[PDB]
Design a protein around this ligand. Structure first.
Ligand SMILES: *C(=S)NCCCC[S@@](C)=O
Ligand SMILES: *C(=S)NCCCC[S@@](C)=O
Ligand SMILES: [Cl-]
Ligand SMILES: [Cl-]
Ligand SMILES: [Cl-]
Ligand SMILES: [Cl-]
Ligand SMILES: [Cl-]
Ligand SMILES: [Cl-]
Ligand SMILES: [Cl-]
Ligand code: NA
Ligand code: NA
Ligand code: NA
Ligand code: NA
Lengths: 114, 114, 114
């Protein structure tokens, strides 16, 4: 699983341990070992949501399987909750693109998971 | 709709109103209210296009529907025009990846659009 | 072809001419002329892989065709090799998402490749 968050919120407002919490909570959410979870946080971005420059975020969650209608709603409640509580970003100013990746299309360790 | 632009042009060369201009133009192009549109511009990037470092841009346009052969050809003209005038990027040094997203794979406000 | 690398390694550790090496190596691996190849390297990122902040990378390779089981394994060996040699990133701390793009979904110079 790979979770990426792009936001206009300043780096200083990202709480210590945020990447660790994301790793831990995504491991529990996806059911995959935390060892394989990758997290990427990109603050101080130049972005807008609805024409407003107030706090917002554009994210991505890639995973080989464990992606679906019900699961994605669950991931959204989890992730929007964290962005709201930890980064003070309103849930309605966050978009998360979910990708169900084929094992053959994910490279790792000089090979792929296929 | 979500539009992201990654470019090597300096932050100082990105007009302060560019995000709003993109939002408004994309609202008209997609026929969606500006409120639903998110924009993200990433300047000062380390990039090369065709083995050259002159101004260039790698972009992404995500949308739940409103994506297709004909529509994409139209978006390219709209976006290349904006990047050409406001960021000084030659249109033949711009790539735009279009993504037609399923509502179930787009998270927002603690849920998804499905 | 479009190759993007997001890594936590410092900018200073990115060798001069690294972009050129990626361009030429990708031209060889994909068979496409270098004039159409785009490369993007993003260092100094706030990332974690397996919860650890040791050197790691999240990448993407977009291409109209030339994507597949065997081909992707080959690309991974090539790209992980370059990241290990040039950026000192362990191959088991690198993920590469491969995307086989439909020509109609890749915009360039006021149109698409369809
Ligand atoms: C997230 S995309 N992890 C990469 C794929 C892991 C394969 S099995 C160990 O889930
Ligand atoms: C762009 S990806 N907007 C996402 C969906 C916006 C709401 S629907 C009701 O158009
Ligand atoms: Cl599901
Ligand atoms: Cl895939
Ligand atoms: Cl269409
Ligand atoms: Cl989708
Ligand atoms: Cl952890
Ligand atoms: Cl193949
Ligand atoms: Cl596609
Ligand atoms: Na998919
Ligand atoms: Na799609
Ligand atoms: Na940056
Ligand atoms: Na594809």
């Amino acid at each position: 699983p790979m979770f990426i968050v792009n936001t206009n919120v300043p780096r200083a407002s990202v709480p210590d341990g945020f990447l660790s919490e994301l790793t831990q909570q995504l491991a529990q959410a996806t059911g995959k070992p935390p060892q394989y979870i990758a997290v990427h946080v990109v603050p101080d971005q130049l972005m807008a949501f609805g024409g407003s420059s107030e706090p917002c975020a554009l994210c991505s969650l890639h995973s080989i399987g464990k992606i679906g209608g019900a699961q994605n709603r669950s991931y959204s409640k989890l992730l929007c909750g964290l962005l709201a509580e930890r980064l003070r970003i309103s849930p309605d100013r966050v978009y998360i693109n979910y990708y169900d990746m084929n094992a053959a299309n994910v490279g790792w360790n000089n090979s792929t998971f296929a």
